[PDB]
Enzyme design. Structure first.
Site, PDB file in Angstrom:
ATOM      1  N   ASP A   8       1.036  -1.182  -0.156  1.00  0.00           N
ATOM      2  CA  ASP A   8      -0.134   0.337  -0.041  1.00  0.00           C
ATOM      3  C   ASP A   8       0.726   1.659   0.374  1.00  0.00           C
ATOM      4  O   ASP A   8       2.242   1.035   0.479  1.00  0.00           O
ATOM      5  CB  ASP A   8      -0.463   0.233   1.424  1.00  0.00           C
ATOM      6  N   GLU A  10       0.592   5.564   0.823  1.00  0.00           N
ATOM      7  CA  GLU A  10      -0.333   7.185   1.132  1.00  0.00           C
ATOM      8  C   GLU A  10       0.588   8.449   0.374  1.00  0.00           C
ATOM      9  O   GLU A  10       2.562   7.930  -0.422  1.00  0.00           O
ATOM     10  CB  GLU A  10      -0.057   7.180   2.532  1.00  0.00           C
ATOM     11  N   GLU A  57      -7.435  16.839   1.269  1.00  0.00           N
ATOM     12  CA  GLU A  57      -8.258  15.384   2.138  1.00  0.00           C
ATOM     13  C   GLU A  57      -7.138  14.797   2.249  1.00  0.00           C
ATOM     14  O   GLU A  57      -7.917  13.593   2.765  1.00  0.00           O
ATOM     15  CB  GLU A  57      -9.153  15.453  -0.119  1.00  0.00           C
ATOM     16  N   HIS A 158      -5.845   5.992   7.879  1.00  0.00           N
ATOM     17  CA  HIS A 158      -5.066   4.681   7.013  1.00  0.00           C
ATOM     18  C   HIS A 158      -3.206   4.968   7.139  1.00  0.00           C
ATOM     19  O   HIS A 158      -3.365   6.730   7.030  1.00  0.00           O
ATOM     20  CB  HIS A 158      -5.908   5.319   5.495  1.00  0.00           C
ATOM     21  N   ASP A 163      -2.819  -0.344   6.833  1.00  0.00           N
ATOM     22  CA  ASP A 163      -2.975  -1.144   5.402  1.00  0.00           C
ATOM     23  C   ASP A 163      -2.949  -2.390   4.821  1.00  0.00           C
ATOM     24  O   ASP A 163      -3.674  -3.446   4.144  1.00  0.00           O
ATOM     25  CB  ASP A 163      -3.487   0.054   4.539  1.00  0.00           C
TER      26      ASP A 163
HETATM   27 MN    MN Z   1      -3.560   2.761   2.746  1.00  0.00          MN
HETATM   28 MN    MN Z   2      -4.406   2.116  -0.548  1.00  0.00          MN
END
Ligand code: MN
Ligand code: MN
Ligand code: U5P
Ligand code: U5P
Length: 176
Positions: A8, A10, A57, A158, A163
Site C-alpha cells: 500500500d 499513502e 483531503e 489509514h 493498510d
Molecule cells: Mn493506505
Molecule cells: Mn491504498
C-alpha cells in the site's frame, strides 16, 4: 518458492482527472511479504519526503503531517532497495492501478530507465478480486475486514504499512 508482496502507499493526494498521480508524490510505502500463505514478517516500510504539501483531503485520510516528512528520505533514496524488495513478486494491492501508477510515476522521475513495475512484478488488484468474489457488495478494505473478521480497529487513519498488513490478512482469507 514464490513471494507475494502485499503493498500500500499513502500519497500527497490524487487527481480526479487525467493521470491520477501527476504532480503528487508517494509519502509512505508499506509492504508485507507473504510466502506459502504465511506472513514472513520481513516487510518494507518507509515514509518519504515529497517536497510538496499534502493536500487537505489526503491528510484527512492518513493524518501524515507535512512537518513529519521533512527529515525523511526521498523516493530516489529508497528506490533501489524498494525494487530489490518487490522484484519478481506478485504484488497484491487494493485498487492496484492507484499505487502502481504512483510507483511507476516515481520510478520514471528518477530518469534511470526503470521499466514499468508490471514488467518485473505480477500485479494483482485485490479490489478486482474482491469485486469478482463479492459482486454487488461493498469491497472497500474496511468492508472486507468486516467480512473476514480482520481487525481494523487501529485504522481510524489509514497508513501504508497498516493498510498493507490488514490487506494481507484480508487477502489470505479471501484466497483461503
Ligand atoms: Mn493506505
Ligand atoms: Mn491504498
Ligand atoms: C480519499 C481517499 C484516498 N486518498 C488518497 O489516496 C491515498 C491512498 O489511500 P488508500 O488507498 O491507502 O486508502 C491516500 O494516501 C490519499 O492521498 C484521498 O486523497 N482521498
Ligand atoms: C485508492 O484506493 C483506495 C482504497 O482504499 P481501501 O478500500 O483500501 O481502504 C481509495 O481510498 C483510493 O484512494
Amino acid at each position: 518458492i514464490t513471494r507475494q508482496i502485499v503493498l500500500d502507499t499513502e500519497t500527497t493526494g490524487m487527481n480526479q482527472i487525467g493521470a491520477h498521480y501527476e504532480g503528487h508524490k508517494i509519502i509512505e510505502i508499506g509492504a508485507v511479504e507473504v510466502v506459502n500463505r504465511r506472513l514472513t514478517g520481513n516487510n518494507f516500510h518507509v515514509y518519504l519526503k515529497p517536497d510538496r504539501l499534502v493536500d487537505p483531503e489526503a491528510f484527512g485520510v492518513h493524518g501524515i503531517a507535512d512537518e513529519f516528512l521533512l527529515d525523511k528520505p526521498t523516493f530516489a533514496e529508497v528506490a533501489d532497495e524498494f525494487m530489490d524488495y518487490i522484484r519478481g513478486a506478485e504484488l497484491v494491492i487494493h485498487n492496484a492501478a492507484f499505487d502502481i501508477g504512483f510507483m511507476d510515476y516515481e520510478f520514471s522521475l528518477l530518469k534511470r530507465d526503470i521499466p514499468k513495475t508490471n514488467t518485473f512484478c505480477k500485479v494483482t488488484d485485490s479490489l478486482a478480486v474482491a469485486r469478482k468474489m463479492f459482486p454487488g457488495k461493498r469491497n472497500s478494505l474496511d468492508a472486507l475486514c468486516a467480512r473476514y473478521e480482520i481487525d481494523n480497529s487501529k485504522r481510524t487513519l489509514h497508513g501504508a504499512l497498516l493498510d498493507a498488513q490488514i490487506l494481507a490478512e484480508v487477502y489470505l482469507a479471501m484466497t483461503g
